[PDB]
Amino acid sequence: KPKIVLISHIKTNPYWLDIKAGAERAAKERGAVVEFLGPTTASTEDGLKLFDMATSAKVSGIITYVQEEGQYKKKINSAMEKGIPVVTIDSDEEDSNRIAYVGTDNVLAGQVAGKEMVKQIGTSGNVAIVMGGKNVKNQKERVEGFTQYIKSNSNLKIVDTDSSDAMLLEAEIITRKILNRNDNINALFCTSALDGIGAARAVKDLNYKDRVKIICFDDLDDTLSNIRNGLVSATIVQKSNEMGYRAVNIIMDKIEGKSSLIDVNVINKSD
Numbered sequence: 001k002p003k004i005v006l007i008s009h010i011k012t013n014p015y016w017l018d019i020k021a022g023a024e025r026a027a028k029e030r031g032a033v034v035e036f037l038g039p040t041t042a043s044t045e046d047g048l049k050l051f052d053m054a055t056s057a058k059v060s061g062i063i064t065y066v067q068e069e070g071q072y073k074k075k076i077n078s079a080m081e082k083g084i085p086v087v088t089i090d091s092d093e094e095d096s097n098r099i100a101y102v103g104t105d106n107v108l109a110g111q112v113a114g115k116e117m118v119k120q121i122g123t124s125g126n127v128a129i130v131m132g133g134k135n136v137k138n139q140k141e142r143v144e145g146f147t148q149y150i151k152s153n154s155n156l157k158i159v160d161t162d163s164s165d166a167m168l169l170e171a172e173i174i175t176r177k178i179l180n181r182n183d184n185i186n187a188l189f190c191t192s193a194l195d196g197i198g199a200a201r202a203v204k205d206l207n208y209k210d211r212v213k214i215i216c217f218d219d220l221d222d223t224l225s226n227i228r229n230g231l232v233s234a235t236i237v238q239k240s241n242e243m244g245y246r247a248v249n250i251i252m253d254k255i256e257g258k259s260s261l262i263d264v265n266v267i268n269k270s271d
């Protein structure tokens, strides 16, 4: 049995458990084993260590999350040179020899969120940002696209940006801190899966629904309920299950000698 290591951002995050589910479905169909790994707290060094161990173990393939630009290139290329195929997932290391990237165009997803934000609150007002790690590659990319969009297409001001490190409780805490130190926030932009849930708890608890609208990421059950009940105005949905499934199929196609980025969708109370 071919063994494929899948290295996640955070092993217990429901987004990554969805990715794992897709990966396991593919592995079942293709007859491979998926070893699903990752740190309990976001850590580039831990990810790289898992990558090193996978490489030393001579596994059949490696699918890896990329937490920081330029930090993965060497190990990816060294693994490719040892004949181990690498796929990146849900954040890319574009300047490497990985055979494929499975995930979103993250700057573009940010632009998409910017357009929805303008649709939801108009062209004037104050926005605060909650990101899942300040120095995390696809978070920075999402903030970059969002910022570019609203800069060119509105008069919206970003008055505060802070980090949850992609944890739910920290998202709640930081969002309360943001609402407390700012006097006229009209909306929150949340860029990782648990951020929107945490932010929603904070706005609900502080009685800011609805003075504060929320645009966030991903379609976790709590987020979809918050869209139903009016707490969240919109969420930007990625195809996480499909990313897992596709990554494993690409690795297996490579091992068996057999031979475009994933669009995002907006979900509203309509949807």
Ligand SMILES: O[C@@H]1[C@@H](O)[C@H](O)OC[C@H]1O
Pocket (backbone or CB within 6 Å): 009, 010, 013, 015, 016, 090, 091, 132, 138, 166, 191, 192, 193, 194, 217, 218
């Ligand atoms: O990197 C992941 C991101 O794509 C998702 O939106 O939020 C959870 C993170 O682990």
